[PDB]
Every structure is written in structure tokens, then in C-alpha cells.
Write an enzyme that holds these catalytic residues in place. Structure first.
Site, short mmCIF file in Angstrom:
data_model
loop_
_atom_site.label_atom_id
_atom_site.label_comp_id
_atom_site.label_asym_id
_atom_site.label_seq_id
_atom_site.Cartn_x
_atom_site.Cartn_y
_atom_site.Cartn_z
N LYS A 30 35.94 -15.99 -46.26
CA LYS A 30 37.16 -15.91 -45.48
C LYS A 30 38.36 -15.57 -46.35
CE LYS A 30 40.11 -18.72 -42.44
NZ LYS A 30 40.16 -17.60 -41.43
N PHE A 66 26.76 -19.63 -44.76
CA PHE A 66 26.63 -18.67 -43.67
C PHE A 66 25.69 -19.08 -42.54
CE2 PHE A 66 24.36 -15.07 -41.81
CZ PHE A 66 25.42 -14.30 -41.32
N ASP A 111 41.87 -27.47 -33.87
CA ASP A 111 41.67 -26.24 -33.11
C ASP A 111 40.22 -25.91 -32.78
OD1 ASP A 111 42.47 -23.91 -31.80
OD2 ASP A 111 42.22 -22.72 -33.64
N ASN A 116 34.51 -21.41 -33.07
CA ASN A 116 34.49 -22.14 -34.35
C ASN A 116 33.30 -23.09 -34.50
OD1 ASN A 116 37.03 -21.17 -35.25
ND2 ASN A 116 38.11 -22.83 -34.19
N1 LIG Z 1 27.99 -15.85 -39.32
C1 LIG Z 1 29.05 -16.77 -39.75
N2 LIG Z 1 28.88 -17.68 -40.73
C2 LIG Z 1 30.03 -18.36 -40.88
C3 LIG Z 1 30.38 -19.39 -41.77
C4 LIG Z 1 31.70 -19.95 -41.71
C5 LIG Z 1 32.68 -19.46 -40.78
C6 LIG Z 1 34.07 -20.07 -40.76
O1 LIG Z 1 34.38 -20.99 -41.55
C7 LIG Z 1 35.10 -19.52 -39.75
C8 LIG Z 1 36.24 -18.79 -40.24
F1 LIG Z 1 36.40 -18.56 -41.54
C9 LIG Z 1 37.25 -18.25 -39.37
C10 LIG Z 1 37.15 -18.45 -37.95
C11 LIG Z 1 36.04 -19.17 -37.40
C12 LIG Z 1 35.04 -19.71 -38.28
F2 LIG Z 1 34.04 -20.37 -37.68
C13 LIG Z 1 32.25 -18.41 -39.91
N3 LIG Z 1 31.00 -17.86 -39.94
C14 LIG Z 1 30.35 -16.85 -39.20
C15 LIG Z 1 30.78 -15.96 -38.11
O2 LIG Z 1 29.93 -15.15 -37.66
C16 LIG Z 1 32.12 -15.96 -37.47
C17 LIG Z 1 32.33 -16.65 -36.23
C18 LIG Z 1 33.64 -16.64 -35.62
C19 LIG Z 1 34.73 -15.95 -36.25
C20 LIG Z 1 34.53 -15.27 -37.49
C21 LIG Z 1 33.22 -15.27 -38.11
#
Ligand SMILES: Nc1nc2ccc(C(=O)c3c(F)cccc3F)cn2c1C(=O)c1ccccc1
Length: 266
Positions: A30, A66, A111, A116
Site C-alpha cells: 500500500k 496478501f 472504517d 476492507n
Molecule cells: N488481494 C489483497 N490482499 C490484501 C492485503 C491487504 C490489503 C489492505 O490492507 C487494504 C488496503 F491497503 C487499502 C484498502 C483496503 C484494504 F483492505 C488489501 N489486500 C487485497 C486487495 O485485493 C484489495 C481489496 C480492497 C481494496 C484494495 C486492495
């Protein structure tokens, strides 16, 4: 950082799926006082909380474990038949454990939303990422309470619970006032009887229309009485009467909880 190989952008900061050019590990990357605040989060480890593996500060990237899919994509993918109740109950149970854990350390998510919550092939669900949708915002936040509590997370979760059951968002507001009014139209306009001190809230207006509360039987059918009993307690207006995550884990609804495995198409 040069230690990763962006594999794909998986969602707009921006989240990329990436491979650690060293450990071969695939991670979610991120791209984003806040420093020490995030380092503490790195100590908040629980099986139902997406693991924050590393924090790379250089001129801020958060390296997370992930997971292959979020709940929103899963609900959408299960819209025709819906998510089987046994799995809904298992997810709610696990998320409550995660919150019980977070909340015990005086940490709030603030949130929660389907996007999420991430799931895996083994039946686990985890809290991640501790216009912006208002659909899951607790009423005290909408009324301008500056010092809200862990109860705001229970509200959000109760909402996701209702949505999993009905396959439709519970309060799909498209503005702060529309959000508030959708909550009022369903749960009744709050007053001093059900929420002592509510009229003294910063954004409370005596001019708010007065809507009558609707029966839960009409809100989340066909959820059974234990389920409706739990949801009702998760959606109480008074943040102080709202059920805690810990007590929620002891509700009769979970007496027969199991951990089914979902069928996922990765
Ligand atoms: N495959 C994934 N592995 C992870 C691991 C951590 C976060 C995580 O910590 C997270 C973030 F960094 C921002 C918003 C929401 C989140 F859940 C998001 N993902 C995903 C996604 O596919 C995904 C889902 C929704 C939005 C963006 C990516």
C-alpha cells in the site's frame, strides 16, 4: 522500494500485489506521529487481522500479507444464491474476535466495510486497512461526536451482517444527511428516551423528521430470532447500550457456529 516487484495494481493510496524480490514472498503493498502510530499497529497481531509485515518509510509504503479476495467481491459473486448462513455466522464470529482483540488494546478500526474485509480459501476472514462510503458509519459519528468509541466498529459490523443476509446494503446513504435519514427511517428517529443526550449532539437538529421504528423481522428476513436479537443489539443507538465485541461472542447465535470453507474462484 527496490526489494519488491510490482506484480499488479489491485486497487486505488494505491494497493499493488507485489513479490519480494528476495524472500519470493508475495505481498500487498500500500502506497500512502503517524510513524509511531503505525509501528504500534505492527504489534497488533491476530489471526483475524491482516498482518502488517513491514513499514517502509522512504522519500510511505505498508507491506501487508496478501489475501486473494475481499468480502465485497465475494458478496457480489454470491448475489444469486447469497452467502450460506453457516458461513455468514462464521465470518461474523471471526470478525468479532478480531474486534474483541483490537478493542482490548484500545485500538479502533473506524472504517469497516465489505471492501476492507479479506477472505481466504480456508474459511478465514480478516480486518484490513485500519468517494468514501458512509453506508457503515455509526450515528454518533454522523451526529458530530468527536470522541466516539469502539462501539462505532460494532455498528459497522452489524451493518455488514445485515447486508450479507439480505444481499443488499442496509443503509446506502449518498450524503451525510441521507445516511442519517435512512438510519432514522428504519430504526426510528432517536430521542432522549432511547439515546440519553442525543439532542445535545453537535449536529442534532430538533427539526429532524420523526420516523417510527420498523420491526427487525421486516429488516433482515429470513434471519432467525437469535440473529435478529444479536443484530438489534449491534445497532442500538446509544453507543453505551450497544453490545461489545466480547459479549457478542457469547450470544446464543454463535452456540452452533462452525468454520465452513467458501468456494472461491481466484
Ligand atoms: N488481494 C489483497 N490482499 C490484501 C492485503 C491487504 C490489503 C489492505 O490492507 C487494504 C488496503 F491497503 C487499502 C484498502 C483496503 C484494504 F483492505 C488489501 N489486500 C487485497 C486487495 O485485493 C484489495 C481489496 C480492497 C481494496 C484494495 C486492495
Amino acid at each position: 522500494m527496490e526489494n519488491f516487484q510490482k506484480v499488479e495494481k489491485i486497487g486505488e493510496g494505491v494497493v499493488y500485489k507485489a513479490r519480494n524480490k528476495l524472500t519470493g514472498e508475495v505481498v500487498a503493498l500500500k502506497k500512502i506521529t503517524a510513524i509511531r502510530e503505525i509501528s504500534l499497529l505492527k504489534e497488533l497481531n491476530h489471526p483475524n487481522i491482516v498482518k502488517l509485515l513491514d513499514v517502509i518509510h522512504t522519500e510511505l509504503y505498508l507491506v501487508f500479507e496478501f489475501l486473494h479476495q475481499d468480502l465485497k467481491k465475494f458478496m457480489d459473486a454470491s448475489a444469486l444464491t447469497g452467502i450460506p448462513l453457516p458461513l455468514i455466522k462464521s465470518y461474523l464470529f471471526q470478525l468479532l474476535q478480531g474486534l474483541a482483540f483490537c478493542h482490548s488494546h484500545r485500538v479502533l478500526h473506524r472504517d469497516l466495510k465489505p471492501q476492507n474485509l479479506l477472505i481466504n480459501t480456508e474459511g478465514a476472514i480478516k480486518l484490513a486497512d485500519f468517494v468514501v462510503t458512509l453506508w457503515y458509519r455509526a450515528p454518533e459519528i454522523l451526529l458530530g461526536c468527536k470522541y466516539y468509541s469502539t462501539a462505532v466498529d460494532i455498528w459497522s459490523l452489524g451493518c455488514i451482517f445485515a447486508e450479507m443476509v439480505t444481499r443488499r446494503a442496509l443503509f446506502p446513504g449518498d450524503s451525510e444527511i441521507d445516511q442519517l435519514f435512512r438510519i432514522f427511517r428504519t430504526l426510528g428517529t432517536p430521542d432522549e428516551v432511547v439515546w440519553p443526550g442525543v439532542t445535545s449532539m453537535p449536529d442534532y437538529k430538533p427539526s429532524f423528521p420523526k420516523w417510527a421504528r420498523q420491526d427487525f423481522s421486516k429488516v433482515v428476513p429470513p434471519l432467525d430470532e437469535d440473529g435478529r436479537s444479536l443484530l438489534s443489539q449491534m445497532l442500538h443507538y446509544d453507543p453505551n447500550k450497544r453490545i461489545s465485541a466480547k459479549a457478542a461472542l457469547a450470544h446464543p447465535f454463535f452456540q452452533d457456529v462452525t468454520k465452513p470453507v467458501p468456494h472461491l474462484r481466484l
